[PDB]
PDB file of C-alpha atoms in Angstrom:
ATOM      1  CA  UNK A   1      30.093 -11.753-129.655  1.00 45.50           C
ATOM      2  CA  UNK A   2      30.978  -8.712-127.936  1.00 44.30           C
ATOM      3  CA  UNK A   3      33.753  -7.795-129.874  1.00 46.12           C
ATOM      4  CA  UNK A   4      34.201  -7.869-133.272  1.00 44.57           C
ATOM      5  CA  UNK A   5      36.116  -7.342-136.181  1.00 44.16           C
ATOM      6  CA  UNK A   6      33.776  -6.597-139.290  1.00 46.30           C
ATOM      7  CA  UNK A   7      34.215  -5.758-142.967  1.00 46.32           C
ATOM      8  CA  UNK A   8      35.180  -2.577-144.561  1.00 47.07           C
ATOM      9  CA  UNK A   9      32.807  -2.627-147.597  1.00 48.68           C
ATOM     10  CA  UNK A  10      29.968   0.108-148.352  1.00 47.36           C
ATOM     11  CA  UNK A  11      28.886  -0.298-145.059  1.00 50.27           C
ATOM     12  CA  UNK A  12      31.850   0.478-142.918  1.00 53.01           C
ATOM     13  CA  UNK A  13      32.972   3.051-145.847  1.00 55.15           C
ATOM     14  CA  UNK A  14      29.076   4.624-145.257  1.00 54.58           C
ATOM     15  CA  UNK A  15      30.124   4.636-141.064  1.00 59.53           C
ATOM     16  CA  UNK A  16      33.256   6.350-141.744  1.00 56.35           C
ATOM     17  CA  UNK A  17      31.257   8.905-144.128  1.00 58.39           C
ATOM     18  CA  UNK A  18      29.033  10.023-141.557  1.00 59.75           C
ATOM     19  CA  UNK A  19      31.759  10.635-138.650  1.00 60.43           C
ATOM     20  CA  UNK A  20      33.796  12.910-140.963  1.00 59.44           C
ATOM     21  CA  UNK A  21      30.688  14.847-141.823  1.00 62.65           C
ATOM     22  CA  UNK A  22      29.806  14.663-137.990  1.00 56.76           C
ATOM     23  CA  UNK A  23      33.400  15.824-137.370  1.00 57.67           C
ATOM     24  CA  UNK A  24      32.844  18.756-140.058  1.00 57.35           C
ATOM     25  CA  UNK A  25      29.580  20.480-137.536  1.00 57.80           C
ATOM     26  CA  UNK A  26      32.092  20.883-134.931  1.00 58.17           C
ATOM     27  CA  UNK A  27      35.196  21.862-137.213  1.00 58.90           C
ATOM     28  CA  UNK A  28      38.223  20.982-135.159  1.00 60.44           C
ATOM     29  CA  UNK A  29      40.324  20.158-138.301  1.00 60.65           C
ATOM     30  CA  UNK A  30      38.925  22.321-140.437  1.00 61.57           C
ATOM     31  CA  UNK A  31      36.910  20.712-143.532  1.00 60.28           C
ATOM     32  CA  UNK A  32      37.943  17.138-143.761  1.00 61.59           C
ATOM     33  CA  UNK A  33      37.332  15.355-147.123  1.00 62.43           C
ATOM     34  CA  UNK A  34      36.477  11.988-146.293  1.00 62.73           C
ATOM     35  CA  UNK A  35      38.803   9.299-147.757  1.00 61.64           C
ATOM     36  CA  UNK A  36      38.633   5.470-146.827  1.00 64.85           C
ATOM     37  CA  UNK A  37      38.003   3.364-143.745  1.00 63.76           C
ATOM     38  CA  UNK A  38      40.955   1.110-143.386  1.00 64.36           C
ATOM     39  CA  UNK A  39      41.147  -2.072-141.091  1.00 66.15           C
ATOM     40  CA  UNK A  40      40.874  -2.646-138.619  1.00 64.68           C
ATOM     41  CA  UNK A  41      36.667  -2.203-137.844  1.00 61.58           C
ATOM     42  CA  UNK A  42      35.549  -2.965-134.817  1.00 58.60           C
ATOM     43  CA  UNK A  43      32.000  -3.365-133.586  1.00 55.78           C
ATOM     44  CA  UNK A  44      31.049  -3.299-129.928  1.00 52.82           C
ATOM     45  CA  UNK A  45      27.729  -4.786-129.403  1.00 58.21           C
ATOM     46  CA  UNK A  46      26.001  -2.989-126.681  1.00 57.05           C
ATOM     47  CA  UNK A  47      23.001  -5.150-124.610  1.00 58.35           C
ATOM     48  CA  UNK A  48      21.629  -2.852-121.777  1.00 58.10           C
ATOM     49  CA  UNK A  49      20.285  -0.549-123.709  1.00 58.04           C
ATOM     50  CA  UNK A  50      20.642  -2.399-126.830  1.00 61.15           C
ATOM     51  CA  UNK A  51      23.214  -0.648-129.913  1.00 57.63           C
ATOM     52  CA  UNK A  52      26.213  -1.083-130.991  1.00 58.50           C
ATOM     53  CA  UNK A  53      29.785   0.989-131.563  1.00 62.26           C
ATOM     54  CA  UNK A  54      31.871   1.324-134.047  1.00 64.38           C
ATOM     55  CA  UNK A  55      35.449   2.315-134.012  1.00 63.05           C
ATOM     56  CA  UNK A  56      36.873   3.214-137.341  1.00 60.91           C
ATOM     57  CA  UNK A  57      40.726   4.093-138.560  1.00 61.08           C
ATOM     58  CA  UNK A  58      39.106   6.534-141.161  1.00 62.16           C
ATOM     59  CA  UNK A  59      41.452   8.925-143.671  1.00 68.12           C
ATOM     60  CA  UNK A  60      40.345  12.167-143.831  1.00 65.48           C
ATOM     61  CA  UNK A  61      42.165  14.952-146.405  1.00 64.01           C
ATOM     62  CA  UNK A  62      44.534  12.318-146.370  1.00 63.60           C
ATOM     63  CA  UNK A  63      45.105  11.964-142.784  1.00 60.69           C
ATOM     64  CA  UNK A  64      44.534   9.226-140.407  1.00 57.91           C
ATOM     65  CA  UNK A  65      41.961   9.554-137.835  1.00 54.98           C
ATOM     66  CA  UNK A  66      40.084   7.271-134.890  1.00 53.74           C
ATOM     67  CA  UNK A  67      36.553   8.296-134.888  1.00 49.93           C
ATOM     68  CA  UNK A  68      34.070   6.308-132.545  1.00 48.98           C
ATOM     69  CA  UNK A  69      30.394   5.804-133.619  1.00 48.28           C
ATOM     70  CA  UNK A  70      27.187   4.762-131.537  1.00 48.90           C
ATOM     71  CA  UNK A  71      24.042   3.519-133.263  1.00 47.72           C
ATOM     72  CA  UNK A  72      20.850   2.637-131.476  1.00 47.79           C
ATOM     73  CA  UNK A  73      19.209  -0.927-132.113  1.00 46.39           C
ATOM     74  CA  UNK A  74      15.595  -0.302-132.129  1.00 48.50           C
ATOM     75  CA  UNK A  75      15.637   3.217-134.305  1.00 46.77           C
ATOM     76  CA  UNK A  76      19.580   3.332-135.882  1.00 46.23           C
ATOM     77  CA  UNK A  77      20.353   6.432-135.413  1.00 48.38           C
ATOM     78  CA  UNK A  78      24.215   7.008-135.283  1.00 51.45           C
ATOM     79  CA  UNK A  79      26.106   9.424-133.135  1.00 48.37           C
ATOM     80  CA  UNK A  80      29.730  10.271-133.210  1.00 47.22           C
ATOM     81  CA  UNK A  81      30.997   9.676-129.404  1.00 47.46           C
ATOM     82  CA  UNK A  82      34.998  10.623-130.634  1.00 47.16           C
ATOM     83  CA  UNK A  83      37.092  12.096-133.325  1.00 44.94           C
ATOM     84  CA  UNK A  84      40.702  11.802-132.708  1.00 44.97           C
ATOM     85  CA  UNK A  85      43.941  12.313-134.405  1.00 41.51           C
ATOM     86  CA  UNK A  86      45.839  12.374-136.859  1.00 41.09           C
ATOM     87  CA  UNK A  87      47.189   9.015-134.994  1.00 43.50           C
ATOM     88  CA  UNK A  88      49.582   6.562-136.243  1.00 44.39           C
ATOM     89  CA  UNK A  89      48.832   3.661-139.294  1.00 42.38           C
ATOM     90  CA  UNK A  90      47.320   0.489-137.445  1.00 43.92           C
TER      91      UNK A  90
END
């Protein structure tokens, strides 16, 4: 569907992995270690263009961020869209 709540295995964890070191070119918080993605994932599928997003509850030097991620269909490459926080346990 449109919306969706996915896993947080290797894959997810690999999502979250890339926004913190995404987050640590622009250095708002200093350098964040990542952590863990926690639940809940969700993945927006995207149809005009095709892609998807991903919004992650990601800890980061043990603090709790929302990071949003797009990745294009056709080639996958990922950009973080949003890095916010810290923000409160889901």
């Amino acid at each position: 569907g449109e919306w969706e709540i996915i896993d947080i295995g290797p894959f997810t964890q690999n999502l979250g992995k890339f926004a913190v070191d995404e987050e640590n070119k622009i250095g708002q918080y200093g350098r964040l270690t990542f952590n863990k993605v926690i639940r809940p994932c969700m993945k927006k599928t995207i149809y005009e263009p095709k892609g998807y997003e991903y919004q992650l509850y990601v800890y980061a030097s043990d603090k709790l961020f929302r990071a949003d991620i797009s990745e294009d269909y056709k080639t996958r490459g990922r950009k973080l869209l949003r890095f916010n926080g810290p923000v409160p346990p889901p």
